[PDB]
């Protein structure tokens, strides 16, 4: 139906040994938007073993052009060698109502990208 | 000055063992665009050692609201152990001249992201 590209854009080290993984969600400029989302992710090590399962909440976005993206944060104890995350469930707050969101909507970054630096 | 965010968005395996590294460039929504760019990249292993040095060319962009971003591809013999790339030079085709582009303009993705599956 609708489109959400999703990728991890940063990792923030917080007090209390918490790591906050920042995800940017983007509707690609299709300005058919989304209500508040609830996303459940399995955090996995490099071997593919499940570490923890956590939920992530997003604001409503995408019904306009300068609201095409929104940022969400996933919190867990930073003591985990997290390498990948798998979206296993998603919920949309629309109409003040609980509605299930099809996982096919997501366009995840399922590839290790080249890191880019700039010379001095 | 001007702004270009840049990140690697996919790797495409081609016949003849060629790899196409896809880059997304974004001028952040400014009304000042860029002529065709020629970008020189050091492809490096994970240890930071330079493997090969290659050039990447882009279309002109940032000059209309539907060209705020552009996608470029770097084709090379799909070279084993590339982990990172470093921008060491950039040249802009502007007004009949090849002009040097200050590297400070670039806002690179200098971060290893979590992989996401569904
Ligand atoms: Cl044209
Ligand atoms: Na440690």
Automatic annotation (TrEMBL), chain A:
Highest taxon above the source species: Bacteria
Annotated protein name in UniProt: IrmA family protein
Included stretch of the parent chain: 28 to 147 of 151
